[PDB]
Amino acid sequence: EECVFPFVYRNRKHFDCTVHGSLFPWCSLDADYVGRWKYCAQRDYAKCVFPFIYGGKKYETCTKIGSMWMSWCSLSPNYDKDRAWKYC
Amino acid sequence: EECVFPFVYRNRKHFDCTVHGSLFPWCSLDADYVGRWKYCAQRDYAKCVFPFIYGGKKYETCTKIGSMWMSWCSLSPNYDKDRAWKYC
Amino acid sequence: EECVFPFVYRNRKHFDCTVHGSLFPWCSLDADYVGRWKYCAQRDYAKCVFPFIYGGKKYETCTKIGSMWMSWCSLSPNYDKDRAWKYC
Amino acid sequence: EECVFPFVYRNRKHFDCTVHGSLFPWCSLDADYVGRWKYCAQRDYAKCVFPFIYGGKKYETCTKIGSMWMSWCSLSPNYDKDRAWKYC
Ligand SMILES: C[N+](C)(C)CCOP(=O)(O)O
Ligand SMILES: C[N+](C)(C)CCOP(=O)(O)O
Ligand SMILES: C[N+](C)(C)CCOP(=O)(O)O
Ligand SMILES: C[N+](C)(C)CCOP(=O)(O)O
Ligand SMILES: C[N+](C)(C)CCOP(=O)(O)O
Ligand SMILES: C[N+](C)(C)CCOP(=O)(O)O
Ligand SMILES: C[N+](C)(C)CCOP(=O)(O)O
Ligand SMILES: C[N+](C)(C)CCOP(=O)(O)O
């Protein structure tokens, strides 16, 4: 099945596939981990979440604001809160 | 005679042939072990139980979900409860 | 694809899935290993080969001859030569 | 500009963005590195090359064969020769 982001595993919140406790990226099929997980294929990795809030401002695309080198995007609607992100 | 699954032997519940107390896999001929048993041949091993509950969801076939290597199935109607399984 | 039995891997001949160099049973998809392999599902394990030669005699079913406890079968047409077998 | 795959840098052939000589993945803008390069964004990474030769066989799609974890594809027409790949 599909990955559920974010998911909580051992009290740790994940907004993307993780190598936490693994040799290969995996994701939970449930927000609250109950034993269902799978290794991640390219399509399974978390995609940019638009729009997202950063510094109290709304972003509709990848941005260099707050980075100034490589554009990035949030992996949740509110980066200020979750701080989950990835380079684009 | 025929294996009875699950069977209880020395405080352990077995849903398949076991090496519990032996070198070669065996099974009890009674739900509650009372001295009747036999060594398991290929046909004696437990078969998949469908459907089965896993991660609070109903599965009608084997699944690769939750396994680091191969598709598997529960050996009881409720894997979450019994945790008994085999690869497919 | 399908397993090829027997297959040679690092000069070792295998007539069934093996854990040789692995944490889980696997098989080569080519008689002469060239990098193609897969983990084995139940259907992939080597099945009895009938008829098979043992002690210069032909066997059409699993036999206890030469064992006298649990019936077994060869995993190749000529056990005398290959010595590959499994309990039935 | 755009990545050129494969590209040669300091005696190494790269069929995808690389961390060779850096902390962040990059790629040469020329087959033979001559000073033109850029850091890779998601879109810059090499894409699967179909069909590709693997184990002397022709593959038209990604395959789980040969991988301990995930389906993959070659980054060149001949994996046996180049050994360049990526997960799918
Ligand atoms: C980390 N993992 C989810 C890939 C495997 C271990 O899972 P679990 O044994 O904590 O349920
Ligand atoms: C997400 N980021 C680290 C790339 C840039 C924003 O950084 P910060 O202002 O939240 O520290
Ligand atoms: C002896 N042993 C502890 C390894 C296994 C079987 O013990 P028991 O619980 O059946 O008495
Ligand atoms: C534990 N399980 C029944 C969910 C799956 C089998 O686990 P694994 O040992 O193949 O990774
Ligand atoms: C043993 N194995 C085939 C599962 C993996 C290692 O394969 P290889 O690296 O010798 O080609
Ligand atoms: C195959 N076997 C070991 C079960 C019985 C035959 O043994 P052997 O006569 O080849 O030694
Ligand atoms: C320095 N290093 C050996 C770790 C990696 C890069 O070396 P080089 O071959 O590019 O000169
Ligand atoms: C090496 N390969 C390209 C055949 C497959 C990937 O290997 P693995 O590291 O996922 O097991």
Best probe residue, ligand 8, of D57, D65, D67 (max atoms within 8 Å of C-beta): D67
Find, in chain B, the residue whose alpha carbon is nearest to that of A24: B68
**Rounded Cα gap, residues B80 and A35, in angstroms:** 9
Angle B28-B32-B36 (CA atoms, 0-180°, nearest 5)? Answer: 40
Contact yes or no for D25/D15 (Cβ under 8 A): no
**Rounded Cα gap, residues A68 and A83, in angstroms:** 17
**Alpha-carbon B79 to chain mean position:** 10
**Rounded Cα gap, residues A21 and C81, in angstroms:** 46
**Rounded Cα gap, residues A72 and D23, in angstroms:** 17
Q: Determine the residue among A39, A43, A48, A69 to mutate to test chain D binding: the one whose Cβ has the most chain D Cβ atoms within 10 Å.
A: A39
Contact yes or no for B73/B63 (Cβ under 8 A): yes
Structural tokens at position C29: 């998809």
Rounded to whole angstroms, what are the CA distances from C36 to B64, C1, C12? 21, 9, 16
Q: Is A87 on the interface with D (CB under 8 A)?
A: yes
Contact yes or no for C46/C22 (Cβ under 8 A): no
Structural tokens at position C79: 């056990």
Structural tokens at position D14: 């790269």
Best probe residue, ligand 7, of D11, D13, D22, D26 (max atoms within 8 Å of C-beta): D11
Instruction: Please name the helix (run of DSSP H) or strand (run of DSSP E) that holds residue C81, with its range, or none.
Output: helix C79-82
The DSSP string of D11-69 is: TEEESS-B-TTSSS-EEESSSB-SS-EEE--GGGS----SSEEETTEEESS-B-TT-SS
Of the candidates B33, B66, A79, the one whose C-alpha atom is nearest the C-alpha of residue B74 is B66
**Rounded Cα gap, residues A51 and A74, in angstroms:** 9
Q: Give the start-end residues of each E strand in chain A.
A: 7-9, 12-14, 26-28, 37-39, 52-54, 57-59, 72-74, 85-87
**Alpha-carbon D72 to chain mean position:** 12
Chain breaks of chain B after residues with C–N above 2.5 Å:
none
Contact yes or no for D79/D52 (Cβ under 8 A): yes
Residues in chain B: 88
The DSSP string of C23-76 is: SS-EEESSSB-SS-EEEPPGGGSPPP-SSEEETTEEESS-B-TTTSSS-EEESS
Q: Is C67 on the interface with B (CB under 8 A)?
A: no
DSSP state, residue C1: -
User: Which ligand 5 atom minimizes the distance to the CA of C35?
Assistant: 11
Q: What is the pairing mode between strands D7-9 and B26-28?
A: unpaired
Q: Is C88 on the interface with B (CB under 8 A)?
A: yes
DSSP state, residue A25: -
**Contacts with D5 (C-beta within 8 Å, 6 or more apart), sequence order:** D14, D15, D16, D27, D46, D75
Resolution of this entry in Å?
1.8
Question: Percent helix, strand, coil in chain B (nearest 5)?
Answer: 10, 30, 60
**Structural domains in chain A plus CATH codes:** 1-40 (2.10.10.10), 45-88 (2.10.10.10)
**Rounded Cα gap, residues B14 and B5, in angstroms:** 7
Q: Is A35 on the interface with B (CB under 8 A)?
A: yes
Contact yes or no for D65/D88 (Cβ under 8 A): no
